[PDB]
Amino acid sequence: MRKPKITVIGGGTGSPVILKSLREKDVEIAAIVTVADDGGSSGELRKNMQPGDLRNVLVAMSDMPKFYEKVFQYRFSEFAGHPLGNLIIAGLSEMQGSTYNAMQLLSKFFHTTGKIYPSSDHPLTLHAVFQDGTEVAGESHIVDHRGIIDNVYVTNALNDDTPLASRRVVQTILESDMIVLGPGSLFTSILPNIVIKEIGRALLETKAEIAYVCNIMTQRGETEHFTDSDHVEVLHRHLGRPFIDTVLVNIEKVPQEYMNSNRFDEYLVQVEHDFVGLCKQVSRVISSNFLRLENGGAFHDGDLIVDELMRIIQVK
Amino acid sequence: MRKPKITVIGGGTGSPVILKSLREKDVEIAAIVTVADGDLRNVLVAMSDMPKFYEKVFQYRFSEDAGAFAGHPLGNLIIAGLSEMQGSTYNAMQLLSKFFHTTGKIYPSSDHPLTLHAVFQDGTEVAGESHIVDHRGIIDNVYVTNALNDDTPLASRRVVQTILESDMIVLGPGSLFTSILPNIVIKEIGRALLETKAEIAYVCNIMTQRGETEHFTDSDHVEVLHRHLGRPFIDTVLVNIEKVPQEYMNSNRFDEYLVQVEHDFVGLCKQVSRVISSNFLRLENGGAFHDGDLIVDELMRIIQV
Ligand SMILES: [Cl-]
């Protein structure tokens, strides 16, 4: 029998430990990331503009992840106090004119294993609509805009045509045994991928099991009572129909004392749990301890997550 | 048969050309470089899994629009950041190699970081490489000390064994006083060169350098190497006899005081058993450079396992 095939979509915060654990298993891995608001197509002056989804996936799928985490994370103190490795992605992107144009150089540089694909082969802009109706374009701008995000959408930077998937992307989704959405920020990591029509169709049609790994914590632009159920609801609304087959949610408590002592943003809280609402929406709901309290934060435990995923995975 | 084992000692602009050609041949390569308080950088890129890639990446500089970072090269950022992480460039050598996915072996010459010292013909002493090249005068001799203590510099782990087990040692090309000699004035390395059964080959410079007289002939380069190691030790010497045209030099903005090395066959023959005088000149990127393939073709033709 062939190795199972697993495609991770989003690649936000928490995906590197999932990707590490997946690599220890006997499985092929593909990652899909959005690379938007990019280069000459961003509509910004060159001085004005100068993200982690790509960096996280690149380092996690590199030939020496431990090595490259150490390296892509050290900070000068000496310039003066900036992270090395953020400077490498900055450099190659400036060199090539956009991060999109740098992506093949970047996979060469990190000696990546498996496939990393952009969601589209054309330049994309990310748009957020806030609760009051205000529309903001650009991830860095969205993230800086005060308020609660209602919805996101993507457009082509260079024209009014409907954005299109990069097609090796469609085939990858359709030929997978499992799709892992997340973990990552819902609005700025996961959703930009699924709002491209050809990707939303592939998710709907794939024989793969679709698994969503929910956040440990609420994010900027999310309310205190934005439940795990609510996260599933937003995903389903953005794609246009229900489509998650399995949802994994953490129910182990993040102690207040740990959040206080570790100087967490005081408005980020543990994602509230709504079992009834999850069950109404998703066939298989997995609530368990998937929490790792280490390195000053409340992160996903990659192995506890991936052990569940390997238990349910089936070759299609 | 076995693959021949070739150790390359020194290098300027220089070694990368020789290392590139050697990599095309079926040979095991070791490189020995001097680490002070450059040549390391060029050997790292030359021995990497993607030299053209790393060369481009290395030398891109942030643009005028990169605010605070504007103008700084990417590769120097990398080498300086790993250096700082490890406490020194010397400390960072293993990580440097791992990153460039280097083939073969790269060794620092010495067991600690060094300071180069030069004694000038008028008796003046200057410490530090940059200070030496900037001092007005003619260099008589160089020696090395450890930067952090007064102990005799020793060879790093494996360097003596590597020299002794080699089929051939290639010295140069590169600045004699600041690239080649600092490696061989480490006493353990000098002794390893005197004792090794490896064929010792010296590739002479195309052009004279700072610290050297206009009439510093190929033969005088050999005399200086021999004098620093204390005995004759070079088995083969490869010298270029093709003329670097003056119009070429003028067009490409060459320094006027520096001339092409003068050929002295009789003097060479008095000192070294095998003297190879031929066209090893490549006039290419606004420079007078060594042709790596022609030099390496000659060396391969001489080599025995
Ligand atoms: Cl989280």
From Swiss-Prot, chain A:
GO-annotated biological processes: regulation of cell shape
Keyword annotations = Cytoplasm
Q: Which CDD domains match?
A: CofD_YvcK (cd07044)
**What InterPro entries does its record include?**
CofD, CofD-like_dom_sf, Gluconeogen_factor
Compartments reported by the entry: Cytoplasm
Q: What GO MF terms are annotated?
A: LPPG:FO 2-phospho-L-lactate transferase activity
A Pfam family assignment: CofD
Q: State where it is primarily located.
A: cytoplasm
Gene Ontology cellular-component terms for this entry are: cytoplasm
Hey, which family's this protein in?
Answer: Belongs to the gluconeogenesis factor family.
NCBIfam families in the cross-refs: CofD_related (TIGR01826)
Cited HAMAP family: Gluconeogen_factor
Role, per record: Required for morphogenesis under gluconeogenic growth conditions.
What's the protein called, per UniProt? Putative gluconeogenesis factor
